[PDB]
């Protein structure tokens, strides 16, 4: 960690520090010693835990601890049974079933457990294999790994930098820092200390960056992980192991359920122990409690529903790498998004053009076919000709049918933008360019900042010479003697100069690259047609031009970005733009896209409007803030928190990846779920750190995709709002499913408590409740996930992570006490009906379990005096258990019907709106019929055939459940916030 | 707060009171259908089971005649059962009637209605259980190799056993078949090996027949016919191998009577006896 950057040092200082020479360089022996000391020039991959370890760790998450305890208790009970000879068995079956359930839940959780993998492979395209290094005063190609700090390296054009080097001898070297800043604009390189910040020093080449053109010589100052790219990779890979909000909510729900189960088990175990109960019965009852209290199929159902939502979203061209990412989006409070490539097409295009003393607006859509901006007016033909002729960019071959915007052009970015504009508006420039016999003299230089090209018109009448000029507007103007307005070349005046200056000021303030265009006519008297020309600028004039027009390029935002941003903001999500671009362009794009409202103004804007010093203006009035990289650098965490809290709309510019990660962390410190959208390597740390990271598909780099939880294959920003809606809907449906499962949990639990307390014959067996959990409750639980939104999802604000939980106290109270007890009562009614009709009245069943289960007794007397054998008693017990199970299923049908909506009535939501509900009801009925008749026809698993009437005994109780829930929801709707909404609403 | 707690507690009290009221109302509505005289269904207890008096733990009867404590449990249980069969308990003629001493056809004593008050019961005297009545015999039969078990048929309300038809020969010529008014009962070694050591079996029943007389049935449910005395059939072996465990199965033969593999006590016995010398 060498953070003491050294770029201000001169050549002699560098030589003294690293003990090397520019001409000589590091010696081979010295190079080997340095390799041994420091190490190879490579990025060390992160340590990855074996997938087997993760799979086994998945065997203890959730309720698996309780299931393992239950299996151990079942084995103990079976051992006790074997000791005291008893061929009952039925415990090994329970143990095997519990073990299989644990295994299945572990597998489902593993398939739901993120993706892991590594991100170092993403840098394969970068990280050049070999480099040219001078050793012993000689140049020899050496592998990049063997490269060590101190040796002299030379980089030509079109090759990756071998390592972080400090340029010493550069001749017009240009490099691309898209990896660091995320901007593809070439950056000039030199050998002087330009900027204090090393990232902008302008005299330091960076590892894995590409040298666009020119040649330079540099001294290695960093290697491997010590390089900037190495540190970014370390941040991206190392960090990123955290629990998503959905996982935290699931853990909280598991904690609640496990605590309830453990507390009930302890209390009732102590009670049974203090009631003169054999340890065997105590352990059996403990196993029953554990089975009843643990919803086995809930977690697998959650995984299945998440997978279904992921499949639908992928069908919507929104790939989801991590399964929990579907829910993570939505319930998000802050969105930190990159400017270039994410909110912008990343393609330089002409937006505004000023001529005739008035401003025009040009279409900036990527799929646009053509646009019109008062083209009928004069002075437009001259501008079109000047743009078409005065250009060097060319289309790549084989792009006839390819869209012109999507075509590839071999030239400068601005040149490509003008070429695209001319193709869109004018037509095919190839024929136009061919018509005019352009003169090879096309001198353009950085110092000149103008380029002119002599042309001869193809008009038969005129057939005269045409000179075209463009460049920096100021020098173009000062080479302009007259200005042509609507055809006439009005001489340049003070008024015209002032208007031009004002237009240039406004265009520059809109953060656009303004370029001036001017041409002159050459009468045949001075320069005849055969007159020969020289590019040395001596054969032709270079002044007294006629200014024609002015236009700028902005790199406009994506077509759908503004609408998506507006919808996200209206949905209560705060949008923050973090970019590595210049503050002016960032502010302009933020205003255009809608991150900053039109009426809202920054403190600098307020000061400018009031014509006062910035310190004088109070910060309260300003509702928007633009913070550069340096200000964030010299900002304590408290100041950052205050800034985030106080300002609704914030724009960050010139931020390094570390600063992006700092911003993400600061946002997360406000108890807010943050989602980061990016498409660049510099976004990798932020994408990893953020709760959900969305990476742009087509424009995104491999690193962004690998470090992103979600990928937008089609690069449409409306997928963000779609995902927000899907996440909120998933949250609601998960609440409904959890309540549905808990209701049946309590319904199963109550009978065992009654059996222990009142000593009734076992109303229901453990295997029956296992069948309830893993059978009839699967399809209904999945169907509840298909429910439509009851109200407008977007209108609601994002849910607070702390205050709002997936499973709250009201939900548990309603599911456990309110609806669970109703189902228990219905089941007990059916049980008593079953027993009474066979000769056992309800009062005779009190404290009858001890004699009931005694295998020795074969003449037990019922209420009518009849005597029952042991087997007949247990067959009646199985019939009662089956009746209880059927009653539970029947009441669970009404439970599902009521649970399909939380506030609306069934009449409003529509009974048949969701067909998966009816599929689930049919599944419940079919499973019950199979278990009762197919199984049970031969008595197995405590199942027996049931009489017809025993199916319909519990219907009135289901009707009562539905009526009660409907009345509750009706009174909630009638009186909002009237002590009924506060308590009853869940 | 206190007020909110009071409101919530009141709501829950009312809600649970209403739930309990609904539950008890549904239970009472269901109970209205059932009748206190006869059960609605007799699916489970339709074919009556066969059970023994000594009420042994695991179908095992092991004892040593020398030590009284070995057979004290069995003797005490048998005495406890037979207590109500003494002639003193049947001295009252208001409810006990001296029915025929010879087996007769089942006598319908009315219908299952609250009218006609109660029903009289044909009394059963212990004298018919010769060698096992306990009147003259002491400790019943549990002297040296004389185990005695009393076989009884599980009471089923409104059930009239049908003795096997003479169409097919039940077993070895019974001579005293008398199928019109006797339900045959036979005891034999469970497996081929046991038959060798089981020795001979002595049956003591009413009138000398080896079965339950039909005059006692049908039973009327302990409400219309309280103090009902079911017929008994005492079985005594009097000769069996010593220090060897014998599996003995007792079976009741009748067209109405049924059998099942799942239920071993449905019209059949599985009893193991071992007299430790
Ligand atoms: C005899 C055998 C009976 C068997 C029947 C089944 C019994 C099973 C019962 C289970 C109940 C489980 C309760 C789960 C609690 C979760 C804890 C938790 O993490 O909750 C989170 C909440 C968050 O709330 P918030 O900030 O969103 O609220 C905002 C309020 N606003 C709107 C005013 C601003 O924290 C809170 O509210 C505080 C929650 C405190 C919960 C106290 C529970 C007290 C005791 C319950 C035992 C019930 C016995 C029933 C006996 C029945 C016999 C017939
Ligand atoms: C997709 C969502 C819905 C899932 C529904 C799952 C339902 C599972 C129920 C299966 C019961 C099938 C019964 C078929 C019996 C045919 C008998 C003939 O005739 C002599 C036979 C002795 C039979 C012993 C039992 C054999 C097989 C049943 C095994 C079931 C195990 C289930 C464990 C998980 C609850
Ligand atoms: C066990 C207990 C199970 C029973 C428990 C609950 C049943 C409650 C009764 C059913 C619910 C009421 C009927 C209902 O609310 O209907 C509504 C729909 C029409 O709503 P919409 O689309 O015009 O709303 C438009 C909304 N806006 C105005 C915003 C555009 O009416 C329709 O579609 C046509 C059907 C309406 C007529 C009633 C049909 C009754 C049939 C079945 C009930 C469920 C029995 C389940 C038994 C087990 C089956 C195996
Ligand atoms: C508004 C629309 C929904 C209305 C409610 C629908 C659900 C309840 C309605 C009917 C359920 C019972 C009837 C089911 C269909 C008829 C099946 C049946 O045949 O059912 C008869 C049993 C009573 O049979 P039994 O004594 O006449 O048979 C004598 C047999 N033998 C002659 C051999 C001695 O009816 C019984 O169990 C009655 C059980 C009493 C408790 C039921 C719950 C009462 C709560 C209210
Ligand atoms: C945690 C537990 C808290 C509660 C504990 C309660 C303990 C009660 C124990 C003993 C009290 C006995 C006092 C009455 C006996 C004499 C009167 C009599 O016996 O009348 C009985 C009838 O009763 C009634 O009509 C009222 C209903 C009484 C139902 C009692 C059910 C007992 C079962 C309780 C378990 C409930 C479990 C619920 C759990 C829910 C969890 C959320 C006898 O009718 P029968 O059979 O002769 O009718 C024959 C037919 N017919 C009437 C047409 C002639
Ligand atoms: C009379 C008896 C049967 C009532 C038993 C009620 C018991 C089971 C209830 C009452 C209070 C409940 C606890 C309330 C708060 C918490 C903290 C939470 O982080 C885990 C669940 C846990 C620990 C609950 C478990 C269940 C609980 C202990
Ligand atoms: C009858 C006795 C013995 C057992 C049942 C007691 C009932 C009334 C108790 C047990 C648990 C209690 C609830 C526990 C938690 C809450 C959440 C709180 O924000 C409002 C009160 C409320 C909703 C309580 C209401 C009363 C309650 C339901
Ligand atoms: C058994 O009874 C018979 C008469 O039925 C009697 O002769 C015999 O002596 C009795 N048994 C014993 C051991 O006395
Ligand atoms: F396009 Al960027 F940081 F501005 F990735
Ligand atoms: K359960
Ligand atoms: K992430
Ligand atoms: K459940
Ligand atoms: Mg980008």
Numbering used by the authors:
A (entry chain A): 51 to 1036
B (entry chain B): 28 to 304
Question: From the publication, what sentences describe this entry?
Answer:
The Cryo-EM structures of Lys794Ala and Lys794Ser in the K+-bound E2-Pi were solved at 2.80 and 2.99 Å resolution, respectively. The global structures of these mutants were indistinguishable from WT − ngHKA. In contrast, Lys794Ser displays two strong densities at sites I and II (valence 1.03 and 1.07, respectively), representing two bound K+ ions, as reported in a similar gHKA mutant. First, Na+ augmented the activity of both mutants (Lys794Ser at [K+] ≥ 0.5 mM, and Lys794Ala at [K+] ≥ 10 mM), but not of WT pumps. Transient currents were small in WT- and Lys794Ala-injected oocytes, but much larger in NKA- or Lys794Ser-injected ones. The Q–V curves are sigmoidal for NKA (squares) or Lys794Ser (triangles), while the small charge moved by Lys794Ala (diamonds) and WT-ngHKA (circles) lacks sigmoidicity. Asp945 forms a salt bridge (dotted lines) with Arg949 in the E2-Pi structures of WT-, K794A-, and K794S-ngHKA.
Here we study primary-active transport via P-type ATPases using functional and structural analyses to demonstrate that four simultaneous residue substitutions transform the non-gastric H+/K+ pump, a strict H+-dependent electroneutral P-type ATPase, into a bona fide Na+-dependent electrogenic Na+/K+ pump. P-type 2C ATPases are obligatory heterodimers formed by a catalytic α subunit and a auxiliary β subunit. The exquisite ion selectivity and stoichiometry characteristics of these pumps are determined by their ion-binding sites, formed between transmembrane helixes TM4-TM8 of the catalytic subunit.
